[PDB]
Amino acid sequence: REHWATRLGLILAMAGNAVGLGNFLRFPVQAAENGGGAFMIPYIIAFLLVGIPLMWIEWAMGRYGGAQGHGTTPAIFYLLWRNRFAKILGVFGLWIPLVVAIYYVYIESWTLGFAIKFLVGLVPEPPPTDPDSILRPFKEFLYSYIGVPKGDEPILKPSLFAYIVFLITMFINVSILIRGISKGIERFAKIAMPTLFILAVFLVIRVFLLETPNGTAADGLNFLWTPDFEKLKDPGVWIAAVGQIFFTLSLGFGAIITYASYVRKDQDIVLSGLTAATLNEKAEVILGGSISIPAAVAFFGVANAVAIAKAGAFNLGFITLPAIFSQTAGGTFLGFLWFFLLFFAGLTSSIAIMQPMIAFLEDELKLSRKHAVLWTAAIVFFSAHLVMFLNKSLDEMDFWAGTIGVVFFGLTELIIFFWIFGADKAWEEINRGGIIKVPRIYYYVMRYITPAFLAVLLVVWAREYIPKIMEETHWTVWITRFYIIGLFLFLTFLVFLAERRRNHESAGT
Ligand SMILES: CCCCCCCCO[C@@H]1O[C@H](CO)[C@@H](O)[C@H](O)[C@H]1O
Ligand SMILES: CCCCCCCCO[C@@H]1O[C@H](CO)[C@@H](O)[C@H](O)[C@H]1O
Ligand SMILES: CCCCCCCCO[C@@H]1O[C@H](CO)[C@@H](O)[C@H](O)[C@H]1O
Ligand SMILES: CCCCCCCCO[C@@H]1O[C@H](CO)[C@@H](O)[C@H](O)[C@H]1O
Ligand SMILES: CCCCCCCCO[C@@H]1O[C@H](CO)[C@@H](O)[C@H](O)[C@H]1O
Ligand SMILES: CC(C)C[C@H](N)C(=O)O
Numbered sequence: 466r467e468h469w470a471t472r473l474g475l476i477l478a479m480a481g482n483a484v485g486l487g488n489f490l491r492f493p494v495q496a497a498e499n500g501g502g503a504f505m506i507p508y509i510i511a512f513l514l515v516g517i518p519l520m521w522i523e524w525a526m527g528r529y530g531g532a533q534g535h536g537t538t539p540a541i542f543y544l545l546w547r548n549r550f551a552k553i554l555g556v557f558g559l560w561i562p563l564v565v566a567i568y569y570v571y572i573e574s575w576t577l578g579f580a581i582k583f584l585v586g587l588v589p590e591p592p593p594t595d596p597d598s599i600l601r602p603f604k605e606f607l608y609s610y611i612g613v614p615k616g617d618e619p620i621l622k623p624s625l626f627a628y629i630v631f632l633i634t635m636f637i638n639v640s641i642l643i644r645g646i647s648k649g650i651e652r653f654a655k656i657a658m659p660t661l662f663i664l665a666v667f668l669v670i671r672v673f674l675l676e677t678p679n680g681t682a683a684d685g686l687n688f689l690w691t692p693d694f695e696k697l698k699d700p701g702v703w704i705a706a707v708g709q710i711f712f713t714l715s716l717g718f719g720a721i722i723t724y725a726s727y728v729r730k731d732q733d734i735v736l737s738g739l740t741a742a743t744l745n746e747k748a749e750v751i752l753g754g755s756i757s758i759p760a761a762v763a764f765f766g767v768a769n770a771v772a773i774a775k776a777g778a779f780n781l782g783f784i785t786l787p788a789i790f791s792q793t794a795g796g797t798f799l800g801f802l803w804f805f806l807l808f809f810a811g812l813t814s815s816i817a818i819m820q821p822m823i824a825f826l827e828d829e830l831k832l833s834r835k836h837a838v839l840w841t842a843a844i845v846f847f848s849a850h851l852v853m854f855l856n857k858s859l860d861e862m863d864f865w866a867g868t869i870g871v872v873f874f875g876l877t878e879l880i881i882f883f884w885i886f887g888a889d890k891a892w893e894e895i896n897r898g899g900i901i902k903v904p905r906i907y908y909y910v911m912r913y914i915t916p917a918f919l920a921v922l923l924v925v926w927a928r929e930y931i932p933k934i935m936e937e938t939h940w941t942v943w944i945t946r947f948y949i950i951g952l953f954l955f956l957t958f959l960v961f962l963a964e965r966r967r968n969h970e971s972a973g974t
């Protein structure tokens with residue numbers, strides 16, 4: 466089996482797994498929509514009660530499976546719980562990353578396309594004072610790129626440039642993955658992560674220099690870091706916070722599990738897992754939190770900045786920020802640096818959510834790496850046509866896989882590892898070879914608190930939010946639901962073929 470070559474390479478690869486579009490695009494919007502500082506308390510609590518403990522659990526499961534030649538959940542769940550239902554539950558650990566990859570790589574390609582256009586100066590020219598006259602051109606720029614519907618039909622018409630850039634983006638992902646764990650992902654991470662940190666710090670510094678009649682960057686920081694205990698009683702803020710913690714730490718996506726399956730059986734995962742999680746949180750709350758919101762608040766003030774965040778998931782990052790930058794000397798190049806930052810952030814993450822399908826094809830169907838990467842790329846490329854052409858398909862996938870699915874799967878993997886496999890065997894497995902030990906209090910959090918927390922959250926989700934999503938949506942959501950259910954059936958069939966192959970192999974040995 467492949468292994469990470471160095472400790473630093475492993476840490477930077479896992480940090481790159483985590484530090485993505487989630488830190489720079491998703492976090493600011495989630496925080497802004499939910500009262501800034503009012504979001505942060507639940508967010509910190511969720512990190513401590515869900516993020517940290519689940520990170521350790523996923524590292525442990527991955528390392529445990531890898532020692533036996535398995536990096537994905539169909540096989541790993543079965544190793545933990547020898548029951549056919551384990552294998553079926555395990556399909557989610559392939560299905561989630563695949564469905565998320567389908568839309569995530571497309572959004573990642575937008576950042577490459579924008580980076581290129583900002584670099585070469587093919588960007589809107591706002592008329593030099595009224596905000597709308599400054600934002601509108603950038604709104605139109607994004608809408609023309611992805612082809613937002615201008616009429617009634619729920620159909621997208623991406624530009625030719627966007628489509629070609631998606632092809633290039635797929636090619637770049639493949640070129641890293643096809644080189645494997647140590648020569649591909651690890652090597653790339655040693656270059657991308659420092660570059661990413663440098664760009665982000667530079668952008669924070671530039672943003673902190675912003676001052677207008679409407680405010681300063683510091684007003685943005687105060688908004689985000691001022692506690693509001695009157696929201697702690699709102700289930701919505703908790704659901705938001707926990708969802709962001711899952712997405713941001715790559716938890717419940719089977720991706721941490723697969724990366725950890727390349728860690729040697731003896732190697733520490735306690736300090737390593739904690740460091741990766743901690744690096745992600747610094748990049749999220751310090752870097753991600755200090756770019757978009759402070760820029761927006763400085764130029765528009767808090768109320769408007771909040772209204773912008775609520776407008777869409779992409780307004781703040783693809784429209785508002787570049788518009789703000791355009792009003793400053795060298796602002797187009799600053800826009801380039803921003804999109805280049807997002808691209809590297811996305812790229813180090815998308816390789817992580819494609820690796821689970823690759824590992825499954827290698828481990829369970831015995832494909833060569835080359836064929837496993839190419840088939841994985843073909844499935845993602847093909848499927849992405851749904852997200853590229855059908856309005857709001859992206860939103861549906863992000864909900865079922867990227868939102869509900871990961872919380873469900875996080876709870877599932879915890880129950881399988883800490884309840885069925887056995888809490889004490891699980892604890893031993895986590896701490897084995899640890900440079901540090903997990904604090905004793907975390908045994909009780911993992912066994913009792915975390916699962917209760919998640920169960921309650923999932924119930925509130927199903928009761929107070931999913932009814933609307935099932936009944937108040939346009940009929941075209943069933944196109945996406947049909948397709949991703951078919952993907953689940955296809956993956957279950959592959960797991961069935963893998964057990965048949967194992968049966969035929971064992972009969973020959
Ligand atoms: C069922 C269809 C399977 C894959 C068909 C993909 C067809 C891609 O179509 C392309 O879309 C681009 C972006 O809109 C346009 O720039 C090009 O005109 C067009 O060739
Ligand atoms: C990184 C290299 C990507 C090259 C993609 C080329 C896409 C060609 O796209 C064309 O570009 C023309 C000029 O911009 C436009 O007039 C047309 O709308 C468009 O068809
Ligand atoms: C679900 C994924 C398949 C949808 C993408 C199909 C691509 C359709 O392609 C379209 O064909 C039209 C007429 O031929 C042309 O007007 C456009 O150039 C082109 O975008
Ligand atoms: C997955 C749903 C989105 C698919 C993209 C629809 C692209 C619309 O393209 C349409 O294709 C029709 C059939 O070829 C043609 O009759 C029309 O010329 C054209 O408008
Ligand atoms: C609910 C999540 C709380 C996480 C914070 C744990 C802080 C670590 O707490 C420490 O743990 C050590 C090892 O058990 C003990 O030696 C110390 O008594 C204690 O200070
Ligand atoms: C799906 C995950 C790989 C996403 C990544 N953790 C991010 O924050 O963007």
Ligand SMILES: [Cl-]
Pocket residue numbers: 609610624625626627
């Ligand atoms: Cl374009």
Ligand code: NA
Pocket residue numbers: 483484485487488712713714715745749
């Ligand atoms: Na993240």
Ligand code: NA
Pocket residue numbers: 480481482483484485486809810811812813814815
């Ligand atoms: Na990343």
